[model samples]
Target chain A: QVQLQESGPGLVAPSQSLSITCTVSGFSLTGYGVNWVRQPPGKGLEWLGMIWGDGNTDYNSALKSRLSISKDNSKSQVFLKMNSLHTDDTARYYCARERDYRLDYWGQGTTVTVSS
Target chain B: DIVLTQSPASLSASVGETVTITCRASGNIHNYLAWYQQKQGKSPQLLVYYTTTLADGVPSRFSGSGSGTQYSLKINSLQPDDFGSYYCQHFWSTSRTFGGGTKLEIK
Candidate 1:
């Protein structure tokens, strides 16, 4: 019954940074890796990055310059921060648990709308 | 980065009908492709993984097969719950990538 919950602001202004948090329950963050993914309106899913339980991280080459992923193993929580947001960045961000390199559990997803 | 391209950007089907969606990778992914279903405003759910292995609790009606850069997902009998966007993802490389997705609509 492991679950992941995402919390963050629903709206953000262009050029500002977007921050979201994923809190895990029924599982230990130190035992698994967490990944951040996003989907824009009518578009395909994008893999932003991932933070391994040991503090190692990797990002999609195209988005690596603007994305940061980190975690606090003691609290079983992971954080995502994206700087220089634009309208195209408006989408639903999801935090999911990675098991054997595949996503096993996902959060409900939080929509972050970027506007003026 | 392995690029996945899905055919028929959108599909219309009726309940009880059979439907199939195809995903072609730019190069061999060695059975590292996975399928997912996403309903409107909901998180994507894992359906099939490792090309043909169904995820835990997935319906028997959904099947997958293929290899060496090509894959496909087949629904034996479509149900109301099957309507949504279906996407294929490749994870063989460091840069995971997904297809543009195919929207499944009930007629």
Candidate 2:
């Protein structure tokens, strides 16, 4: 069975940057695209961006200016970085495998709190 | 960006009952709609894709149907595990979007 696990700092100061990593197993990174999504506390989910197997990336316009998604195929890992965070950026960040535009496999998610 | 609106923000039903949730798109999204289920504290799971195609391992009791700009997810003979928040998403173009999500609770 395919699985994804996310790891990152649990907290970050406002106006700073946040970085998260997603490690995938039971599936080849070269075979599918990986997408990053986040959900604020008590809010709906939002798509952050994706990194294609071939190294291309696409992001939501709302966050395109501050988001970056990259992959390390050799390590079977995907990375998400966002700059200038705020309290509103506090949320559970998830990395998922995209199969035909649908998120098939997802990570457990890591909560990042933006604080002082 | 395609905006998806889901009706009945919250609902209650009993096991074995049939429930339906509606998703309406702000504009035509063709058939690029997909449905996902998120259990408490877990990542969202794909249930149906491309309007009505069931994802691998999804139960047959879960079905989806719609086209153009409107869609819906229907659960027949709902199970206890079916209680969760369901979201509809549109991927017709680069601007992907998801519905507000409908919370289903067992009555």
Candidate 3:
């Protein structure tokens, strides 16, 4: 079965940069792209950015200034980095697989808390 | 950036009732829209894509349709398990954008 696993620090200090990784299984990781999405404690879904299969990336306007998405296709891994974190950045972060312009699979989100 | 807006911020439904959720984009997206369902703390599940194509493994009762800047997701038979929040996203632009979401309640 296809699966996406996310791993990173659960706690992040405000004003610092946060980095996470999504390791995928069950596909060569060369056919589709990967996207980073997040949801606040009680808010709606937010699109952060995406690393396309062709090595190109696209980010949400609201976060493009601080977000970066990269990947190592050989390792079947994707990376996400966001700088200058704040309390408002606390959210459940998820990595999704994009096939044919739509998200087809997702990782069990990693809950991130931006605090002191 | 494309702004997606979903109407009926929240709605109530009974068993077997047909429910519809609408999503409007700030500009034409050429039907490059997808519908997702989120239940509480779970990750969002894809229901439909490319306006009306059902996602793999999704139920047939969930359908989508639209063109230009308008879109809708209709549930032919609302089941108790379908109560949740639905969101629409437009993939026609470089920057991805999602709707505010509509909450479905069992009534």
Candidate 4:
């Protein structure tokens, strides 16, 4: 079965950086694009960014300056790094793959919190 | 950014009943829309895409329609598993924007 598993920290101090990894299996990461989508506590979904199979990246304008997406084809992993974290950044972050412009396969999600 | 405005923040329905959720975009989306279902504590599941195309493994009871900037997701004969949150998104741009989701509960 095609699956994506998110690996990262559960908490981080405010003003620090956060990093998360999405490790995929049953499909080559270099053959398809992986995207980052998040949701805050008791809120809806948010699209963060994506790293295309070609290694190109695009991000939400709101998080453009604070976010970076990159991938390692050999390890079949995608990474999301964001700096200057704030309380608003506390959310469950997910990594998903796109199909027909929609996210089809998704990770179990990593819950991250920004605190003092 | 194309903002998607979804109506009825939440709904209550009984099994076997039909329910509809609507989404209107800030601009002409040209059917560049998709719908997702997220059960509490689970990852979001793609139900419909490209305005009305059903995703693989999704049931026929879940249907999508509309165009331009407006879209709707109708669940006919709603099943117990259908109770969840629904989100509509527009993919006209690189930064796909999703509307505030609608949560469905059993009546």
For model 4, how many clashes? 0
lDDT of each: 0.90, 0.91, 0.91, 0.92
Model 2: per-residue Cα lDDT over B6-107, one tens digit each: 999999999999999999999999999889999999889899999999998999999999999889899999999999999998888776678999999999
lDDT string, candidate 3, A54-81, tens digits: 8999999878899888999889899999
**Candidate 2 DockQ vs. native:** 0.73
| Model 2: share of real contacts kept | 0.59
Candidate 2 deviant stretches above 4 angstroms = none
User: How many pairs of residues collide in model 3?
Assistant: 0
A94 in model 4: Cα distance from truth in Å?
0.1
Instruction: List, residue by residue over A5-51, the lDDT tens digit for candidate 1.
Output: 99988988999999999999998887788989898877889888888
What's the CA error at residue B34 for candidate 2, in Å?
Answer: 1.2
Cα distance off (Å), candidate 2, residue A60: 0.8
Each prediction's DockQ against the real complex = 0.69, 0.73, 0.73, 0.85
What digit string (tens of lDDT, one per residue) describes model 2 on residues A1-116?
89899998998899999989999999998889998989999889898888888898989998899998989999999999999998999999999888786888889999999999
* Stretch of 10 with least lDDT, candidate 4 chain B: B89-98
Error of 1 at B32 (Å): 0.8
Which DockQ-derived CAPRI band holds candidate 3? medium
The native-contact fractions of the candidates, in order shown, are 0.56, 0.59, 0.49, 0.78
Q: What is the lDDT of residue B79 in candidate 4?
A: 94
Local accuracy of candidate 3 as per-residue lDDT tens digits, B1-107: 88999999999989899988999999999999999999987899999999999987888999998899989999988888999999999898696788999999999
Off by over 4 Å in 4: none
